[PDB]
Design an enzyme around this catalytic site. Structure first.
Site, short mmCIF file in Angstrom:
data_model
loop_
_atom_site.label_atom_id
_atom_site.label_comp_id
_atom_site.label_asym_id
_atom_site.label_seq_id
_atom_site.Cartn_x
_atom_site.Cartn_y
_atom_site.Cartn_z
N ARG A 55 -2.49 2.15 -11.70
CA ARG A 55 -2.07 3.50 -12.02
C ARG A 55 -1.46 3.61 -13.40
NH1 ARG A 55 0.24 5.29 -6.06
NH2 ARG A 55 -1.39 4.17 -4.90
N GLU A 105 0.82 -1.21 0.00
CA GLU A 105 0.00 0.00 0.00
C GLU A 105 0.86 1.26 0.00
OE1 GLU A 105 -2.49 -3.24 0.69
OE2 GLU A 105 -0.81 -2.60 1.95
N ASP A 106 1.60 1.45 -1.09
CA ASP A 106 2.40 2.64 -1.31
C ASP A 106 3.42 2.85 -0.19
OD1 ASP A 106 0.54 2.68 -3.26
OD2 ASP A 106 -0.27 4.67 -2.81
N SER A 107 4.35 1.91 -0.08
CA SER A 107 5.43 2.00 0.89
C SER A 107 6.69 1.45 0.26
CB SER A 107 5.09 1.24 2.17
OG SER A 107 6.04 1.51 3.18
N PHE A 142 -0.50 3.94 2.84
CA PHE A 142 0.65 4.41 3.60
C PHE A 142 1.51 5.38 2.78
CE2 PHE A 142 -0.51 0.24 5.15
CZ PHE A 142 -0.65 0.48 6.49
#
Ligand SMILES: [Mg+2]
Ligand SMILES: [Mg+2]
Ligand SMILES: [Zn+2]
Ligand SMILES: [Zn+2]
Ligand SMILES: [Zn+2]
Ligand SMILES: [Zn+2]
Lengths: 91, 267, 67, 579, 40, 528, 49, 49, 46, 116
Positions: free
Chosen positions: D380, D204-206, F159
């Site tokens: 994306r 999750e976008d880390s 996050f």
């Protein structure tokens, strides 16, 4: 279905088709403290004062405002203490 | 203890900057652990205390301190006779747990004064010179342009170098690149190539040009682990490998003595 | 702002290979041959010089406040 | 037009729009028309010839400039109202040639289509392979990156600054960067990224960031704050002066260590300030009538700002008073929490920092500096990230800064793949990796390569709040900001609604009464007016009924008390009737 | 404190505050008559 | 003007009375932590050394709490204040001899937050009931909150810089209320939709899809290493699927040891042939599509989002319904740990090797897109010949737009189907989409296929440039390239007209996000 | 209120080469704050005599 | 004397209009700073179109 | 040794007292910078 | 700033013990070993040498949190061999392995340096 049912039944409960908004609560019998929160606290307050109304403080927002255990949720009931059962409980 | 491995090791390059060695008849765990003690737990000496009492360089104090602590220090045979600055029975330094450095440079000429390794002067002749200052009897070799400073700018600092693992910081990391490779022809199929033909062929492969992979070896397992360490000058490669093996031995022996205390302390 | 002392990825001491690199560039060497000639033989140890702004030079053109 | 292409009407924006069907000619000469330079096409043939390009190439030796190109009538400024009367070609290489004729009467031609992009959107490489929202997100984040914002930052004293230690040029660069001067003042580093799902701390976008990297200088930055303090003399004898407030012989020391202050009242450069430290010391003088006459009004540093003093300046402002500016320098190493973002609209936070021994590694000891998650790519469709990694691989190997000009038909993915296979790697860019924890090969082959990442100025040390029982306000006695960073978090209407939904009357009571504003009021059972006069001599009394026996205790927010009092002050009598 | 340990408000009756009640309830006896805060 | 002190927002009744500012609250960025159970949050040491909890000294806690008072505010596990019988607070920092401080029965000791305390965790904007769930703390050092990944779906958290609020209840009644009413294991099944609110999320999901394939075989070391991670384990290694030639455990076996209790379920993987359930092989699936959990053991199937994530009748849903909240919350921290450690051996990536297709498919795409453009030209010729007839109830412009849009959309759909049939089982796009982690079929299309028509306000790109869409097109150009159609893929670039038109299309999405962000809580406030 | 609610946040075909199509604040001021293209120049003013 | 009109940095009427790179450095200014911002009370202000 | 200040343009140590005409000598520039402290500060080279 | 000093990953704190030994009641002959202030460098070698025995039925290790410095090894052995004996025999086998390898490596370095 429970939630659509409850919302529609709340709207169509007083026979009218009430705009379920501030316009709705202005046309209910809620006390001065409830309508105090919505738009213009001082005007509804003064109107209720010159007339001498009362807020039964059975609502939730009123008890939350005055810092008391709201009549709903964990506060709907009251608890007592038992003596005969406290006998059976030396330590 | 009848269940040990009897490994065999043979070297293929011993330049003064890298070693290349094949460790055969060993488990994969032991090979990866030897790599991890190359990169992490071989003791090297590096600067860990700077006191800049005169700095006019366009670089601030923390910048010079950091860039200076990342200078490599010849730590060949005077890391086994030094003690970690924590176990010393002294106060913050001593000639047994430190190597005092000094730096003093000001540019009074017009052209820029490149401040280099050579400008760092030590307290111990062989124990540590700053690398790239190996010797003059045997190229610029300014192990860094630590600061460039023009007319009027000065730099005076006093650095101390302690001994450390590489898990504490990347300073005390002897190796530049530890190369690792087993089964270069993909016999065990630990990778499942889609389109196995497009993939390049390993340096250590033993395969003809027409074939792409090796045939499946159902019973086999990892062996013949290939290596290629490098050095940042701070420690010769052979010494890096030997100290890694000695350090793993020390780790395991300390673990065994504490385990003996624990088993005998318990019922 | 100044050529980093070590490659961020593989630790190779790369801070000493920048003035030699500029010398080779002003020596008709191409960038690939200059990087191979200096020993840099990986992505990371090569990107340190191939892409490096040397701002300390445009930052030394200002006079110092201390004389 | 024949005149505007030499000189009688200013070659600059004097538009001429002939609207044919409407039968009008509209000549505009006024400020506010966005013009655009476009070439000229006469009879399906450019007016630009090799002579012009050759003269412009030798620019520094000649006196031939863009103005000589515009005077020669090969480039003219077309505003927008004139644009609806011209037929353009994007590239002369086509659209001026012969086939089934689309248009045989062209009138102009774009210089290069990549000039429709602005400054902060000319940084993003291959911006035609990315989704458009991601391109806007990059135009946003690219304004929040760290770098050498200007060269003379040692003589600027700005309220907030950020200087990345070792910035780098990009390796895959857009050809419109040399005009924004990005090779001169960059804003990032060319990290070796690997789109892998290593251990789970990058979901999750880390991102998983190499600790050895960040410990060798990767993405360190300084944070230069700059405080200000004037020496005012507003009223006569109400003089404020910079001076070390020693002790008694002055009042209001506020119990802080004044050891740092020099005799002037300003801390010296190179003194490690902290939370309970005073940076500037003023001593305003009492009215001299009704300790000495010097109160204490000393600037205190907040704990959210720590570091070491860099510069101290003293001078006279335009109001004439003495006036200082200190600069506190703080070095920030990247750690769990900090925001990093590619040039392609992908932002993340470092979730864990593994060491070099623990990260994956290729056959050659290359360890990734960042491991972004694969799940970021499909929803994306930032397929300019992948191509950027590939071109950066080919570039780092070859030795030339790759070209990622947006609309270029000579940079195909297949050509990059062949260039990469010419150098001994897998052509698509994947490599076989190993697991540093155990050693075994990772089964699937992880995509790895050098991409351009940025450090955004959203560091987590500037975002932590924590209030246990802190400064209270004077009027409402609700929580209030103080020395330490936290003053509270709002328990708004939506959170109240959620706690209503749960059914937690007790927790909602705590949050809205006992963690914000607890109070006890004595109220008269007869008249609800709370104007009891309670006393520690135990005399509860209600003036207004002559009743000292019927007083009860009532707990209610001091906010409710202040409301009922502000009501009583308007002759509205709220009566808390406990019966 | 010891005044009928806390009872919860069950109703809040609103009304206009009479002059007699305000005078009796007020703590300033005469009523505020000097516009200044403090003299000495 | 007192009437103004009592007024709208930042007033008394709404500002300082209904929604207040509260003590015992913190806020820092969220960062993932797959090694924490779903009922745990990771608080830094600063936020834990700041916040406290008033604890009463019963003769059970007396020695421990006196040790805590001795430690002091300085060391981490300590105390900040001691409150005596009468209620008079003592500050543990400003006592001259802190050793002389003796505590009795009835005193309070405000002690720093320690591992095991309950806190209410909130992510603004708090929309549903599942946005103030309560967790236990675990003080692990770095300056960011850390929450499990299966709990990101409830909070709508990603996050990338989100901050999340932590409220620490300050009494035993409120702690018990939150423990027995608002904990995150008790809030899996939402009353809003009869569904589990939190299911397995992206990385673990692609990993379980690759792990429950019938071709995944583990060996002795791997199975022991994985069994080391699941917390509810009898301790008995199961007898492997393949015994000879070599002991080889299959993936569904190890996954059967993390299914809680005896759960009976039947589901359907995404790539299930519709007519598979009708002919033969109805119960011996030739692609493992049919999931059959019979008596706690995964007999047959391949797991996906339709089987263990946020859906009615899911394995997690009936896990809850049948085995209770605690066993179910153990069923989340075992899947995550086991499969997320197996992902170290398997690994997952995404590269350009997946955004490409074989040459035959790229030629098939181009041929379809050529036919589509020729057919649009045919419709345009029928329109310019006035031989087009208005479909019943629409003008001629409307039937023209309908036919051209139908041709273009059938073109995009067939192009995408060919693209998706051009894929290999090893492709990672397909893995993430047939798993359920992220991405749709439309994205696998838009990467290797046509991007598609760019609609603005529900119509093709308007004639906003006086009868043209851009100065490069000639007037009255209704063709595909002249009003939106982007025939190129994302791998093959976008021509400059297509890039501006795609930007025109995405600006509407950004505006829509802005208006939805503006309207988030409107209906909810209005009808609460 | 001077602009009579003509949709200003949308990207207009007229913005080609005059305003960047991919630069605008992603918050409430979406489409309102536009950045200038790389070769866009504003007229300075000239008397029409 | 009728007042003091603010001066846009690096305009024709600045003290920096016709100075080279070395001169800008001697005056302690970045030779890459664009210009186009007034200095009003020490804070740089830009006039958004 | 009183407070030692440095002129921003002639770079001379000026050494002025508490009460002071903050101008510099031999160069009337008002902008003056303080001199670095002489108490030692210790930087861990990491 | 809540950032641990880097020396915590290998140094014992106050009196925290290097190796502790519990007994898990799930199966007959198992035994959990908490090795403190270590990582995978010392985990997977002990695991992969505890697994070459014919009497160790379960050898495996776990680093419960990567931000903490701890490992747990679980050894279940036949009703004859105790887990403690298995662990100690594995550690002695590894030490003998590494001693042999160090001697071989010295011999190989000398041979390459001079004999060639
Ligand atoms: Mg979000
Ligand atoms: Mg998310
Ligand atoms: Zn010593
Ligand atoms: Zn390197
Ligand atoms: Zn009364
Ligand atoms: Zn001077």
């Amino acid at each position: 279905y429970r939630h659509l049912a409850l919302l529609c039944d709340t709207m169509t409960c007083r026979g009218h088709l009430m705009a379920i908004t501030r316009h709705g609560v202005n046309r209910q019998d809620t006390g001065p403290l409830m309508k105090c929160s919505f738009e213009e606290t001082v005007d509804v307050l003064m109107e209720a004062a010159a007339h001498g109304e009362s807020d039964p403080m059975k609502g939730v927002s009123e008890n939350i405002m005055l810092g008391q255990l709201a009549p709903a949720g964990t506060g709907c009931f009251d608890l007592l203490l038992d003596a005969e059962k406290c006998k059976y409980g030396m330590e | 203890m009848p269940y040990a491995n009897q490994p065999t090791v043979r070297i293929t390059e011993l330049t003064d900057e890298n070693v290349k060695f094949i460790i055969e008849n060993t488990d994969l765990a032991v090979a990866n652990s030897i790599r991890r003690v190359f990169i992490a737990e071989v003791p090297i000496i590096a600067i860990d205390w700077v006191q800049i009492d005169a700095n006019s360089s366009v670089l601030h104090d923390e910048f010079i301190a950091h860039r200076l602590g990342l200078i490599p220090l010849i730590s060949d045979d005077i890391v086994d006779k030094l003690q970690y600055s924590r176990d010393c029975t002294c106060e913050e330094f001593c000639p047994e747990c430190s190597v005092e450095f000094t730096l003093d440079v000001r540019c009074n000429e017009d052209q820029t004064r490149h401040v280099t390794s050579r400008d760092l002067i030590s307290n111990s002749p062989r124990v540590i010179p700053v690398t790239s200052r190996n010797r003059d009897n045997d190229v610029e070799q300014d192990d860094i342009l630590i600061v460039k400073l023009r007319k009027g700018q000065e730099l005076r600092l006093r650095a101390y170098a302690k001994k450390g693992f590489g898990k504490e910081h990347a300073k005390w990391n002897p190796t530049a690149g530890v190369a690792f490779e087993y089964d270069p022809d993909n016999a065990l199929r630990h990778t499942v190539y889609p389109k196995p033909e497009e993939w390049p062929k390993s340096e250590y492969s033993e395969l003809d040009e027409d074939e792409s992979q090796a045939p499946y070896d159902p019973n086999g397992k990892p062996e013949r682990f290939y290596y290629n360490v490098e050095s940042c000058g701070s420690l010769r490669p052979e010494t890096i490998v030997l100290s890694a093996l000695s350090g793993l031995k020390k780790k395991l022996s300390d673990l065994q003595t504490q385990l003996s205390h624990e088993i005998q302390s318990d019922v | 702002m100044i050529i980093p002392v070590r490659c961020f990825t593989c630790g190779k001491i790369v801070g000493n290979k920048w003035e030699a690199y500029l010398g080779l560039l002003q020596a008709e060497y191409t960038e690939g041959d200059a990087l191979d000639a200096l020993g840099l033989k990986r992505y990371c140890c090569r990107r340190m010089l191939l892409a490096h702004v040397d701002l300390i030079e445009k930052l030394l053109n200002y006079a110092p406040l201390e004389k | 037009r024949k005149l505007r292409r030499q000189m009688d009407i200013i070659v600059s924006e004097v538009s001429m729009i002939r609207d044919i069907r409407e039968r009008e000619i509209r000549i505009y000469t006024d400020a506010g028309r966005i013009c655009r330079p476009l070439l000229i096409v006469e009879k399906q043939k450019l007016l630009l010839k090799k002579r012009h390009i050759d003269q412009l190439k030798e620019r520094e030796y000649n006196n031939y400039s863009w103005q000589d190109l515009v005077a020669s009538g090969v480039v003219e400024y077309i505003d927008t109202l004139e644009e609806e009367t011209v037929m353009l070609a994007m590239t002369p290489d086509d659209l001026q040639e012969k086939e089934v004729a689309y248009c045989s009467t062209y009138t102009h031609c774009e210089i290069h289509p990549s000039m429709i992009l602005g400054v902060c959107a000319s940084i993003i490489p291959f911006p035609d392979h990315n989704q458009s929202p991601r391109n806007t997100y990059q135009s946003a984040m690219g304004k929040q990156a760290m770098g050498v914002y200007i060269t003379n930052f040692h003589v600027r004293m700005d309220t907030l600054a950020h200087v990345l230690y070792y910035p780098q040029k990009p390796l895959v660069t857009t050809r419109s960067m040399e005009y924004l001067r990005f090779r001169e003042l960059p804003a990032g580093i060319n990290s070796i990224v690997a789109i892998a799902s290593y251990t789970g701390y990058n979901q999750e976008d880390s991102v998983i960031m190499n600790r050895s990297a960040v410990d060798r200088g990767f993405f360190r930055s300084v944070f230069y704050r700059s405080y200000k303090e004037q020496e005012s003399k507003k009223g006569f004898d109400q003089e404020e002066v910079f001076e070390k407030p020693t002790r008694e012989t002055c009042q209001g020391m506020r119990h802080a260590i004044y050891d740092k202050l020099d005799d002037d009242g300003l801390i010296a450069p190179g003194v490690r300030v902290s939370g309970d430290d005073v940076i500037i010391g003023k001593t305003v003088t009492l009215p001299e009538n009704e300790r000495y006459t010097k109160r204490d009004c000393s600037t205190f540093l907040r704990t959210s700002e720590t570091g070491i003093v860099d510069q101290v300046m003293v001078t006279l402002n335009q109001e004439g008073y003495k006036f200082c500016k200190i600069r506190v320098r703080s070095v920030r190493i990247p750690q769990i929490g900090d925001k990093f973002a590619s040039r392609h609209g992908q932002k993340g936070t470092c979730g864990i920092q593994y060491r070099q021994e623990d990260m994956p590694f290729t056959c050659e000891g290359i360890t990734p500096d960042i491991i972004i998650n694969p799940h970021a790519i499909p929803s994306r469709m930032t397929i300019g990230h992948l191509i950027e990694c590939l071109q950066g691989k080919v570039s780092a190997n070859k030795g030339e800064i790759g070209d990622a000009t947006p609309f270029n038909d000579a940079v195909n993915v297949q050509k990059i793949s062949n260039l990469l296979s010419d150098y001994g790697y897998h052509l698509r860019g994947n490599e076989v990796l190993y697991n540093g924890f155990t050693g075994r090969k990772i089964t699937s082959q992880i995509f790895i390569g050098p991409t351009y990442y940025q450090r955004l100025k959203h560091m987590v040390d500037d975002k932590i709040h924590s209030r246990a029982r802190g400064p209270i306000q004077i009027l409402n006695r609700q929580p209030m900001e103080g020395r330490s960073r936290d003053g509270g978090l709002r328990f708004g209407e939506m959170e109240r609604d959620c706690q209503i939904a749960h059914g937690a009357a007790q927790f909602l009571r705590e949050r809205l009464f006992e963690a914000s504003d607890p109070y006890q009021v004595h109220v008269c059972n007869l008249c609800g007016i709370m104007a009891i006069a309670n006393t520690r001599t135990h005399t509860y009394e209600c003036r207004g009924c002559r009743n000292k026996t019927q007083i009860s205790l009532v707990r209610m927010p001091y906010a409710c008390k202040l409301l009922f009092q502000e009501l009583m002050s308007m002759s509205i009598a709220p009566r808390m009737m406990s019966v | 404190d010891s005044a009928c340990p806390l009872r919860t408000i069950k109703r809040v009756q609103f009304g206009v505050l009479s002059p007699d009640e305000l005078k009796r309830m007020s703590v300033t006896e005469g009523g505020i008559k000097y516009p200044e805060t403090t003299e000495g | 003007s007192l009437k103004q002190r009592l007024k709208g927002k930042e007033g008394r009744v709404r500002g300082n009375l209904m929604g207040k500012r509260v003590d015992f609250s913190a806020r820092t960025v969220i960062t993932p932590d797959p090694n924490l159970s779903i009922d745990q949050v990771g608080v830094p040491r600063s936020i834990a050394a700041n916040m406290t909890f008033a604890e009463i000294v019963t003769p059970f806690n007396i020695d421990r709490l006196q040790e805590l008072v001795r430690r002091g505010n300085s060391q981490y596990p300590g105390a900040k204040y001691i409150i005596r019988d009468n209620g008079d607070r003592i500050d543990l920092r400003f006592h001259p001899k802190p050793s002389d401080l003796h505590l009795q029965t009835g005193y309070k000791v405000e002690r720093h937050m320690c591992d095991g305390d309950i806190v209410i965790f909130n992510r603004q904007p708090t929309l549903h009931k599942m946005s103030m769930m309560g967790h236990r703390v675990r003080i692990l050092p770095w300056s960011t909150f850390r929450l499990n990944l299966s709990v990101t779906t409830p909070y709508n958290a990603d996050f990338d810089g989100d901050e999340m609020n932590l409220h620490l209840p300050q009494s035993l009644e409120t702690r018990a209320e939150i423990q027995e009413l608002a904990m995150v294991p008790r809030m899996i099944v939402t009353p809003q939709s009869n569904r589990p609110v939190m299911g397995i999320v992206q990385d673990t999901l692609t990993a379980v899809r690759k792990f429950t394939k019938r071709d995944v075989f583990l060996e002795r070391g791997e199975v022991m290493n994985l069994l080391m991670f699941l917390s509810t384990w009898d301790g008995k290694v199961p007898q492997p699927a393949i015994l000879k030639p070599r002991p080889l455990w299959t993936g569904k076996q190890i996954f059967s040891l993390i299914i809680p209790g005896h759960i009976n379920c039947i589901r359907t993987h995404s790539t299930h042939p519709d007519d598979e359930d009708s002919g033969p092989y109805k119960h011996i699936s030739p692609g493992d599509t049919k999931v059959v959990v019979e008596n706690g053991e995964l007999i047959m199937g391949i797991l996906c989002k339709k089987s263990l994530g946020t859906s009615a009748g899911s394995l997690v849903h009936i896990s809850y319904l049948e085995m209770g909240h605690d066993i179910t919350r153990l069923f989340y921290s075992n899947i995550q740990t086991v499969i997320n450690n197996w992902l170290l051996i398997e690994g997952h990536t995404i590269g350009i090797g997946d955004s490409i297709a074989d040459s035959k498919t790229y030629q098939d795409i181009q041929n379809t897109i050529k036919k589509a453009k020729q057919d649009v030209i045919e419709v345009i010729e029928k329109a310019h010949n006035n031989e087009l007839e208005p479909t019943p109830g629409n003008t001629l412009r409307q039937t023209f737009e309908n036919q051209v849009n139908r041709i273009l959309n059938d073109a995009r759909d067939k192009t995408g189907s060919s693209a998706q049939k051009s894929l290999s089982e090893y492709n990672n796009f397909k893995s993430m989409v047939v798993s359920g982690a992220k991405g749709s079929k439309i994205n696998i299309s838009q990467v290797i296929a046509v991007v598609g028509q760019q609609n603005v306000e529900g119509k093709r790109i308007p004639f906003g440039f006086k009868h043209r869409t851009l100065p490069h097109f000639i007037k009255d150009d209704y063709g595909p390239e002249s009003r939106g159609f982007v025939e190129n893929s994302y791998l093959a670039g976008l021509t400059p007209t297509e890039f501006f038109f795609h930007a025109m299309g995405g600006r509407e999405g950004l505006i829509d996000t802005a208006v939805k962000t503006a309207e988030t809580g409107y209906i909810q406030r209005r009808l609460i | 209120r001077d602009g009579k609610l003509a949709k200003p946040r949308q990207l207009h075909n007229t913005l080609w080469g005059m305003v960047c199509p991919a630069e605008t604040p992603e918050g409430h001021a979406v489409g309102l704050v536009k950045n200038l293209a790389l070769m866009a120049y504003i007229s300075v003013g000239s008397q029409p005599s | 004397f009728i007042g003091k009109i603010p001066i846009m940095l690096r305009s024709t009427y600045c003290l920096l209009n016709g100075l080279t790179d070395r001169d800008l450095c001697e005056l302690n200014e970045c030779p890459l700073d664009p210009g186009g911002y007034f200095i009003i009370n020490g804070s740089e202000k830009v006039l958004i179109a | 040794q009183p407070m030692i200040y440095i002129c921003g343009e002639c770079h001379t140590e000026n050494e002025i007292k508490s009460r002071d005409p903050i101008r510099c000598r031999e160069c009337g520039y008002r902008i003056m910078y303080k001199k670095r402290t002489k108490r030692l500060v210790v930087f861990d080279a990491r | 700033m809540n950032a641990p000093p880097a020396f915590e990953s290998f140094l014992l704190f106050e009196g925290e013990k290097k190796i502790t030994i519990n007994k898990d009641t799930k199966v007959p002959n198992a035994c959990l070993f908490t090795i403190n202030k270590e990582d995978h460098t010392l985990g997977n070698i002990i695991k992969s040498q505890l697994l070459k025995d014919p009497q160790v039925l379960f050898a495996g290790y776990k680093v419960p949190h990567p931000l903490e410095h701890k490992i747990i090894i679980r050894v279940q052995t036949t009703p004859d061999y105790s887990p403690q004996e298995a662990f100690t025999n594995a550690i002695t086998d590894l030490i003998s392995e590494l001693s042999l390898l160090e001697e071989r490596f010295r011999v190989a370095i000398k041979d390459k340096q001079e004999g060639i």
